Symmetry: C2
Subunit: 98 residues, 2 copies
């Protein structure tokens, strides 16, 4: 079952892993935010709200194999707040839908 909204984390991300995420097209998303957190072991904290419904395999293809991804929960704005809670954003793109 594909869903539209995914959350995801990446502990200790490589720079090639950072560029894979930033190299995504702006059109993939209604809303996209990934903050950097932690620097005793920095992890990425990301929430993606895709335009189309996406499948696990497709969310992993886009973000990276090493990401831990699962269906998101809560309002768009709620996860925006969760992802920008250490105040070091890497990517924001779009606007939070309902």
């Amino acid at each position: 079952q594909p869903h539209k909204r995914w959350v995801f984390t990446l502990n200790n991300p490589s720079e090639d892993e950072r560029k894979k995420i930033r190299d995504l097209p702006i059109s993939l998303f209604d809303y996209f935010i990934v903050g950097e957190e932690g620097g005793r072991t920095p992890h990425l904290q990301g929430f993606a709200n895709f335009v189309k419904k996406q499948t696990f395999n497709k969310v992993k293809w886009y973000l990276g194999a090493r990401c831990h991804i699962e269906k998101a929960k809560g309002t768009d704005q709620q996860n925006k707040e969760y992802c920008s809670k250490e105040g070091n954003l890497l990517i924001e793109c779009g606007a939070p839908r309902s």
Copy 2:
């Protein structure tokens, strides 16, 4: 070369709108383009990461675009591009 540009596209194709929307997140520090319009119209603002000049920008945004170097605050061009309030693309953050 400059980093900050402004552009319009008069009556812009669906293939022209998805060409602009298809662009990488990693090209811009700020990027906004709203739709305005009886003759609809695309008003944008691109604050790249790298310095780019004309022929680079027009390979990215689209040939028949009307581009030029920007002037005003980034939150000024943001207010300009969202005056009509129908946003197509916002990506990054309005810088210094």
